[PDB]
Design an enzyme around this catalytic site. Sequence first.
Site, mmCIF file in Angstrom:
data_model
loop_
_atom_site.group_PDB
_atom_site.id
_atom_site.type_symbol
_atom_site.label_atom_id
_atom_site.label_comp_id
_atom_site.label_asym_id
_atom_site.label_seq_id
_atom_site.Cartn_x
_atom_site.Cartn_y
_atom_site.Cartn_z
ATOM 1 N N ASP A 1 0.931 -1.224 -0.347
ATOM 2 C CA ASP A 1 -0.032 0.291 -0.088
ATOM 3 C C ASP A 1 0.582 1.415 0.009
ATOM 4 O OD1 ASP A 1 -1.750 1.831 0.253
ATOM 5 O OD2 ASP A 1 -3.457 1.012 1.771
ATOM 6 N N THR A 2 1.204 1.541 -1.218
ATOM 7 C CA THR A 2 1.517 3.216 -0.963
ATOM 8 C C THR A 2 1.263 4.474 -0.762
ATOM 9 O OG1 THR A 2 0.219 3.606 -3.515
ATOM 10 C CG2 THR A 2 2.640 2.089 -3.214
ATOM 11 N N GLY A 3 -0.423 4.176 0.077
ATOM 12 C CA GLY A 3 -1.323 5.053 0.572
ATOM 13 C C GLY A 3 -1.099 5.310 1.466
#
EC number: 3.4.23.16
Lengths: 99, 99
Positions: free
Chosen positions: B25-27
């Site tokens: 998850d880059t967020g």
Amino acid sequence: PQITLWKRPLVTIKIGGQLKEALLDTGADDTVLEEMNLPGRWKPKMIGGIGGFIKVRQYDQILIEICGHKAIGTVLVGPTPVNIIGRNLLTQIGCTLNF
Amino acid sequence: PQITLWKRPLVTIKIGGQLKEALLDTGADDTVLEEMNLPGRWKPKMIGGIGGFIKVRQYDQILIEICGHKAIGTVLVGPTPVNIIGRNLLTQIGCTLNF
Ligand SMILES: CC[C@H](C)CN(C[C@@H](O)[C@H](Cc1cc(F)cc(F)c1)NC(=O)O[C@H]1CO[C@H]2OCC[C@H]21)S(=O)(=O)c1ccc([C@H](C)O)cc1
């Protein structure tokens, strides 16, 4: 461009004639944006994340220019704390995770 | 490995002798895992998401093997609906977004 993750992957988007900064989120299946005014008809929907669920307005066939790359897809507008670019739009501009 | 975003970017992780599946998850700024037990002393913390907030136990200097790539860092354990690998650990495995 290749983006390292030492900082938040924030990019500038152009949606409905408005400039905003959004988070390239590989953990998001769809795009969710903070409150704004978008043309056209919408349909109510409820999306879930960490902490529960929020009510958003589903907008279909919305054009967004993400860091100079154009894409059209569904955009959800609601009380998200941060603008999020989901996988529905990341795939259109050809984004990949590499490690 | 290069990962397209047409499906959820799920990887097999090895943490505390247990095998689990987690979402790259880059967020997410932090790694958040469903309930489990890890070593060392922990301190309570509260993290926020799209739906509100959840209470977690902050564990520091925790080893995680993500797809065969080792990394040590803070791991938050709590009622997250999905295991999340945040940027705190993605930077350690050399993960980048490319488009
Ligand atoms: C179920 C899997 C995931 C939890 C889904 N989410 C994506 C995540 O990447 C999310 C992004 C985020 C960043 C942010 F700064 C604020 C925020 F509110 C949300 N990260 C997140 O909650 O991170 C936590 C842990 O680290 C901390 O740092 C930042 C916040 C804290 S989502 O946003 O719920 C979501 C998006 C899109 C759809 C569409 C309908 O499919 C559904 C659900």
